[PDB]
RNA sequence: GGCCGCAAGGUUAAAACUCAAAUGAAUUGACGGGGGCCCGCACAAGCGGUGGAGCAUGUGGUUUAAUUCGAUGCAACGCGAAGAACCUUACCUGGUCUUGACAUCCACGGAAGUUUUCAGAGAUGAGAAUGUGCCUUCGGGAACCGUGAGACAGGUGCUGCAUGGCUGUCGUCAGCUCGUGUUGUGAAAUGUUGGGUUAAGUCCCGCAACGAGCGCAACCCUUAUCCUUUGUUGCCAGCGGUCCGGCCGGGAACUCAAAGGAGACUGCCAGUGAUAAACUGGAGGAAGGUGGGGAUGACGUCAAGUCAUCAUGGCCCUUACGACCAGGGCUACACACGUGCUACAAUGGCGCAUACAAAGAGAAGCGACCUCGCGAGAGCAAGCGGACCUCAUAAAGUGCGUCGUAGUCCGGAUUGGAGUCUGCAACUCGACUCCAUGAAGUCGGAAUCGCUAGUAAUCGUGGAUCAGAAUGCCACGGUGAAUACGU
């Protein structure tokens, strides 16, 4: 799992970087064969947003989530990818 | 484009084509192999003296409608944008969409 | 890519496949009696083969 | 998605150009800037003369400019006092001897550009945008448009959020190339910002390039 | 594709031996559009095939071709978690295409000096059941023989 | 709490607290690891790549005085930029300016120009010479300059989540709707479903629907064949002449040039089919069923993209967020990602010899021939606003020779030395040339992309931008495959 962070209208400090990396380290337990993955953080007026895209072994998984903070945004996002990753795995280990 | 930027292009044209001959002949001796070392050396000091903005390489083709510095076309003197805008009205004689 | 495949043959193999997978005759999508005959023809051939499969 | 300029696409097929001269690269860009200026000037100061089109030819070290209007009286004047003035102050900027003509627009309600402004004016006078739009489509078909469509967009009735509304009636087939459809636009400048207007008028299909 | 491809092409026959078969063989060896270069390489091989078997060319190159054509290949098919290799007849035209491909593939994977040498040697070895080319066919045939039970599925 | 039960428990049966809803049936969509049917380089069948190396280039990161601003899943990352040494340039540092570099208005002064010296990096400041114009009716108005006042100009400052305009995207997918009628208490429904058919809501037959509109197709450009007219700067079949070069007189055939026409419509013929729509095959024909390629993008979606093309609501700055200048920066480099180029060799490297294109550009521009130079180039100077002149000799190919499988006679990065050209000027930071140097690289893990025919692969040529600065972009021909059983 190779990571990449963007900021569209956000300064990526070294909480928001450290935080996001730890939260994403979980995802590998849902599907072992994750490759490079790109993350994007936005602030438009009052809306905090966070989308990521995940290149996986035979697929491309994407989700985005909106919080009232960016942490709460990223918290939301990790729950969305978890479910998609599990769905993927299960329609490969399909015996 | 900032009014100022449009303006400089006028200051720069005007000079360029006033000292045009002075530069040319003052250059002409420089590149003359078969000339006085005394002459040519003077020239080199004399060219660098008369003003920078009077060189033709110093100017930049800007759309003569909006002032844009990028995407210029010589045939029309307009930016790609204004060319398209006018093309579609039929204000550019002949011009029209093409297929082959 | 340039021209549509034989409609009768396709109809016969669609019949076979619903057959093996164990759908009922009377799922047949054809009323064109010509294509219909192909569909059922497959479906009944397939009924034989299921037996000797597991 | 996006849509091709209905005038532009039909240029050779069934429409004419507005400027018709020939030039080599040397003076091509220069005739364009010259033309621009004359239109920029005329439209400015004929604002209130209902002017549709300014077609403009350069015959042979000269320039004749033939300017379509549905109020020719107001352009001409008292046996042509204003027209000669325009002439005087065109040759000023054309840089050559100029002459001017006055084409007559008989049916101003069947002229994309005229109707377009008609609305843009109303909207500037805080008129209800639906009334303007609705009125035009009536007038047009009443006078024998085979079809008509008008779109208007921006901060309609000063709304904090922008939207886009349009009526059509009759045929307006944009994909058919021989179809003479007259199209034009006009920005309106309310206190909320710009409201754009666009108008399509179908007059029927043509059977000859001419 | 889902519909039927209409309009088969026309291979012109060889300038020399006037065979559509050999003409195909050239195309298969051909690289980057260089048809003449390939035309040479091919003839110079057959020379050197002819010059040892002494059995003509359009009749020697054949004998290689027969030692190596397959008659039964395997198709893969996903069944449960597993993938069933299943044996199928080979079409005449296909087994030509495969023989000609396997011969070329085997040639290139050699250490000889010219391309022409590699082809020649390979065609010769083919005629006496020897090279990688012919090894490959043997292996193909082994696999279809193994999982014969899946001969009659239609699935 | 009472009663019942061996127990498990049953039975009767509250309150505090807390929410503004919780629920039933039906409706339109969306979704299903639900079903049916059709398609698609979707898989399959195949060909060549990317991921490894060196280099080019964009982005992220770090760095910086500054590394200008924007584009960010598919649909940002050779993207706006079709071309940052200066300029451009919006950024940094330092030096200056204040009704202002860019307008209109007013008063006053002075024709406008032209030529010089000095100080300064330059902006600018201070001098010096020369000049006195054109209608003005007897006041001068008209220039165009300089100083002064203030109404003002000025802002690539902010918000694309206030907007116009333009654009991507699903998707050139076959859909999306309306009037009247009918059905339902009603959201809605019918039409638009059903049987066939089609690339296609394509067409036909049915049918509480009857009709209509936006799309589909056709009209447009191009390419494939033929005919008429015209024949130079293009053409040379038959003649005659020749310095054997369409070279000359001729010729108007042919090739070609470009205006105008002809042609393809399931029209003709079998078989199938609901006496349909269509389908499958055959004929002739340059072409056959949408012949090939382009242009053309429905109602809408994503508060997608652009306030830095322009315009513009609002907000903010106004001796500074405006204006001028010199130097620097955008080209920085522990590193990560994307797009390319060149390679790793013998279907190849090197030397000699020799064939066959297309399309396009040129005005103060394209620049021959001649002379010089190993070479980049230099000097001189014909022709051409071009079917005429010039760029400008296509390359792969082909023959003959050599190298003999080597980190090589493979590769050409890196670096030293010596030059040329553009340009006030190539230190930071140009392109190219010669001599020397001769790196990584022996065909690239997991993954992953393009393409179905004149396509992929491979080889050369031109153009836009542009003083100079392509491996990018947009175009043009040469050679020219592989394989599709099938779902
Ligand atoms: Mg959580
Ligand atoms: Mg402006
Ligand atoms: Mg420049
Ligand atoms: Mg478009
Ligand atoms: Mg109790
Ligand atoms: Mg008890
Ligand atoms: Mg319910
Ligand atoms: Mg479904
Ligand atoms: Mg595949
Ligand atoms: Mg492959
Ligand atoms: Mg890498
Ligand atoms: Mg690499
Ligand atoms: Mg950036
Ligand atoms: Mg901005
Ligand atoms: Mg700079
Ligand atoms: Mg400063
Ligand atoms: Mg938006
Ligand atoms: Mg943005
Ligand atoms: Mg009712
Ligand atoms: Mg529908
Ligand atoms: Mg409906
Ligand atoms: Mg229905
Ligand atoms: Mg139907
Ligand atoms: Mg229809
Ligand atoms: Mg036929
Ligand atoms: Mg169409
Ligand atoms: Mg947005
Ligand atoms: Mg500067
Ligand atoms: Mg850059
Ligand atoms: Mg390559
Ligand atoms: Mg070498
Ligand atoms: Mg050029
Ligand atoms: Mg020489
Ligand atoms: Mg395709
Ligand atoms: Mg190339």
Curated annotation (Swiss-Prot), chain A:
Keyword list (alphabetical) reads: Translation regulation
GO molecular function annotations of the record: ribosomal small subunit binding; ribosome binding
Q: Which Pfam families match?
A: Ribosomal_S30AE (PF02482)
Q: Which CDD domains match?
A: RaiA
According to the UniProt entry, the coiled-coil residues are none
Q: Name one GO biological process term.
A: negative regulation of translational elongation
Entry keyword annotation includes Acetylation:
no
- GO cellular component terms? cytosol; cytosolic small ribosomal subunit
Gene inactivation phenotype reads: Non-essential gene, no formation of inactive 100S ribosomes. Double hpf-yfiA deletion mutants form 90S ribosomes. A quadruple yfiA-hpf-rmf-sra knockout strain is significantly outcompeted by wild-type after 4 days growth. No change in sensitivity to aminoglycoside antiobiotic gentamicin in stationary phase cultures.
Q: Does the keyword Kinase apply?
A: no
* Record's note on what induces expression: Induced during stationary growth phase (at protein level). Induced by the signal autoinducer AI-2.
> Can you state the subunit structure given in the record?
Associates exclusively with 100S ribosomes, which are dimers of 70S ribosomes.
Describe the task this protein carries out: During stationary phase, promotes and stabilizes dimerization of 70S ribosomes by the ribosome modulation factor (RMF), leading to the formation of inactive 100S ribosomes. Converts immature 90S particles formed by RMF into 100S ribosomes. Crystallization with T.thermophilus 70S ribosomes shows it binds in the channel between the head and body of the 30S subunit, where mRNA, tRNAs, initiation factors IF1 and IF3 and elongation factor G would bind; however RMF is still able to bind.
Q: What is this protein called?
A: Ribosome hibernation promoting factor
Curated annotation (Swiss-Prot), chain B:
What GO terms describe the biological role, i.e. biological process, of this protein? cytoplasmic translation; ribosomal small subunit assembly; translation
Please verify whether the record's keywords include Coiled coil.
Answer: no
**What quaternary structure, including any partners, is listed in this protein's UniProt entry?**
Part of the 30S ribosomal subunit. Contacts proteins S3 and S10.
Q: Cross-referenced InterPro entries, in alphabetical order? A: Ribosomal_uS14, Ribosomal_uS14_bac/plastid, Ribosomal_uS14_CS
Q: Does the keyword Cytoplasm apply?
A: no
What is this protein's function? Binds 16S rRNA, required for the assembly of 30S particles and may also be responsible for determining the conformation of the 16S rRNA at the A site.
Q: Which GO terms describe its molecular function?
A: rRNA binding; structural constituent of ribosome; tRNA binding
Q: Under what name is this protein listed?
A: Small ribosomal subunit protein uS14
Which family does the similarity line name?
A: Belongs to the universal ribosomal protein uS14 family.
Alphabetized Pfam families for the sequence: Ribosomal_S14 (PF00253)
Alphabetically ordered keywords of this record: Ribonucleoprotein, Ribosomal protein
GO terms for cellular component: cytoplasm; cytosolic small ribosomal subunit; small ribosomal subunit
Q: By its UniProt entry, which HAMAP family does this protein fall under?
A: Ribosomal_uS14_1
Which superkingdom does the taxonomy of this entry point to? Bacteria
UniProtKB/Swiss-Prot annotation, chain C:
Q: Protein name, please?
A: Ribosome modulation factor
Q: Where in the cell is it found?
A: Cytoplasm
Q: Among its keywords, does the record have RNA-binding? A: yes
Q: Which family does it belong to?
A: Belongs to the ribosome modulation factor family.
**Gene null: resulting phenotype:** Non-essential gene, 100S ribosome dimers are not formed, decreased cell viability during stationary phase. A quadruple raiA-hpf-rmf-sra knockout strain is significantly outcompeted by wild-type after 4 days growth. Very high sensitivity to aminoglycoside antiobiotic gentamicin in stationary phase cultures.
Q: Which GO terms describe its biological process?
A: cellular response to stress; dormancy process; negative regulation of translation in response to stress
Q: Which GO terms describe its molecular function?
A: ribosomal small subunit binding; ribosome binding; rRNA binding
GO cellular component terms?
cytoplasm
Q: Relay the record's extra comment.
A: When cells are transferred to rich nutritious culture medium, RMF is quickly released from 100S ribosomes, which dissociate into 70S ribosomes. It indicates that this interconversion is a major system regulating translation activity during the transition of growth phases.
Pfam families listed in its UniProt record? RMF
The family database entries (NCBIfam families) matched by this protein are listed as: PRK14563.1 (NF011162), Rmf_CrpP_fam (NF041886)
Q: How does it assemble?
A: Associates exclusively with 100S ribosomes. Contacts 16S rRNA, might contact ribosomal protein S18.
Note the superkingdom of the native organism. Answer: Bacteria
Q: What is the first-listed, main subcellular location in coarse terms? A: cytoplasm
Induction (free text):
Induced during stationary growth phase. Requires ppGpp for translation.
Keywords for this protein: Cytoplasm, RNA-binding, rRNA-binding, Stress response, Translation regulation
Curated annotation (Swiss-Prot), chain D:
InterPro entries under this entry? Answer: KH_dom (IPR004087), KH_dom-like_a/b (IPR015946), KH_dom_type_2 (IPR004044), KH_sf_prok-type (IPR009019), Ribosomal_S3_C_sf (IPR036419), Ribosomal_uS3_bac-typ (IPR005704), Ribosomal_uS3_C (IPR001351), Ribosomal_uS3_CS (IPR018280)
Stretches of the chain forming a coiled coil according to its record: none
Q: Which domain of life does the UniProt lineage start with?
A: Bacteria
Annotated KH type-2 domain residues: 38-106
Among the GO biological process terms of this entry, one is:
cytoplasmic translation
Keyword match Electron transport: no
Q: Which SUPFAM superfamilies does UniProt cross-reference here?
A: Prokaryotic type KH domain (KH-domain type II), Ribosomal protein S3 C-terminal domain
Q: Would you tell me the Gene Ontology cellular component terms?
A: cytoplasm; cytosol; cytosolic small ribosomal subunit
Q: Which GO terms describe its molecular function?
A: mRNA binding; rRNA binding; structural constituent of ribosome
Gene3D superfamilies given for it? 3.30.300.20, Ribosomal protein S3, C-terminal domain
Q: Keywords of this protein's UniProt record, alphabetized?
A: Ribonucleoprotein, Ribosomal protein, RNA-binding, rRNA-binding
Indicate the family of this protein.
Belongs to the universal ribosomal protein uS3 family.
The UniProt subunit note reads as follows:
Part of the 30S ribosomal subunit. Forms a tight complex with proteins uS10 and uS14. With proteins uS4 and uS5 encircles the mRNA as it enters the ribosome, which may play a role in mRNA helicase processivity. Some nascent polypeptide chains are able to cross-link to this protein in situ. In collided ribosomes contacts ribosome rescue factor SmrB.
Give the function comment from the record.
Answer: Binds the lower part of the 30S subunit head. Binds mRNA in the 70S ribosome, positioning it for translation.
Q: Which HAMAP family match?
A: Ribosomal_uS3_B (MF_01309_B)
Q: By what name is this protein known?
A: Small ribosomal subunit protein uS3
Native species: Escherichia coli (strain K12)
Q: What gene makes this protein?
A: rpsC
């Amino acid at each position: 799992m190779q990571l990449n962070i963007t900021g569209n209208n956000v300064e990526i400090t070294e909480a928001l970087r450290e935080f996001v990396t730890a939260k994403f380290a979980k995802l590998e337990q849902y599907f072992d064969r994750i490759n490079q993955v790109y993350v994007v953080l936005k602030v438009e007026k009052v809306t905090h947003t966070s989308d990521a895209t995940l290149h996986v072994n035979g697929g491309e998984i994407h989700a985005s989530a909106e919080g009232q903070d960016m942490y709460a945004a990223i918290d939301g996002l990790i729950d969305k990818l978890a479910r998609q990753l599990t769905k993927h795995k299960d329609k490969l280990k399909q015996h | 484009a900032k009014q100022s930027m449009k303006a400089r292009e006028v200051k720069r044209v005007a000079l360029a084509d006033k000292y045009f001959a002075k530069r040319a002949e003052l250059k002409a001796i420089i590149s003359d192999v078969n000339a006085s070392d005394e002459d040519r050396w003077n020239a080199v000091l004399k060219l660098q003296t008369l003003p920078r903005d009077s060189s033709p390489s110093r100017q930049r083709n800007r759309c003569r409608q909006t002032g844009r510095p990028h995407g210029f076309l010589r045939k029309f003197g307009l930016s790609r944008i204004k060319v398209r805008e006018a093309a579609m009205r039929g204000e550019i004689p002949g011009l029209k969409k093409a297929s082959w | 890519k340039r021209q549509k495949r034989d409609r009768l043959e396709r109809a016969h193999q669609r019949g076979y496949q619903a057959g093996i997978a164990g759908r009922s005759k009377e799922m047949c999508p054809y009323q064109t009696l010509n294509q219909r005959s192909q569909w059922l023809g497959g479906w009944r051939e397939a009924m034989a083969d299921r037996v000797v499969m597991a | 998605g996006q849509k091709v300029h209905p005038n532009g696409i039909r240029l050779g097929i069934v429409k004419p150009w507005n400027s018709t001269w020939f030039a080599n690269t040397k003076e091509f860009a220069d005739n364009l800037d010259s033309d621009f200026k004359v239109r920029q000037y005329l439209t400015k100061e004929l604002a209130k003369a209902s002017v549709s089109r300014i077609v403009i030819e350069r015959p042979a070290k000269s320039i004749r400019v033939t300017i379509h209007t549905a109020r020719p009286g107001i352009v001409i004047g008292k046996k042509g006092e204003d027209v000669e003035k325009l002439r005087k102050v065109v040759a000023d900027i054309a840089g050559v001897p100029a002459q001017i003509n006055i084409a007559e627009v008989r049916k101003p309600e069947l002229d994309a550009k005229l109707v377009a402004d008609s609305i843009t004016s109303q909207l500037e006078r805080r008129v209800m945008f639906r009334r303007a739009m609705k009125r035009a489509v009536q007038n047009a078909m009443r006078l024998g448009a085979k079809g008509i469509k008008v779109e208007v967009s921006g901060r309609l009735g000063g709304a904090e959020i922008a939207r886009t509304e349009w009526y059509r009636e009759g045929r307006v087939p944009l994909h058919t190339l021989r179809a003479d459809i007259d199209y034009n636009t006009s920005e309106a400048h309310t206190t909320y910002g710009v409201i754009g207007v666009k108008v399509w008028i179908f007059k029927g299909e043509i059977l000859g390039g001419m | 594709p889902r519909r039927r491809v209409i309009g088969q092409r026309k291979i012109l026959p060889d300038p020399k031996f006037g065979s559509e078969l050999l003409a195909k063989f050239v195309n298969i060896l051909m690289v980057d559009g260089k048809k003449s270069t390939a035309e040479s390489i091919v003839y110079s091989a057959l020379e050197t095939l002819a010059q040892r078997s002494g059995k003509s060319e359009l009749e020697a190159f054949e004998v290689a071709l027969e030692n190596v054509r397959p008659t039964v290949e395997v198709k893969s098919r996903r069944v449960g978690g597993s993938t069933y290799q299943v044996p199928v007849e080979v079409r005449p035209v296909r087994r030509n295409a495969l023989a000609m491909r396997w011969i070329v593939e085997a040639a290139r994977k050699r250490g000889d000096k010219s391309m022409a040498l590699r082809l020649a040697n390979e065609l010769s070895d083919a005629a006496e059941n020897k090279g990688t080319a012919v090894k490959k066919r043997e292996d193909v045939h082994r696999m279809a023989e193994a999982n014969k039970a899946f001969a009659h599925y239609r699935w």
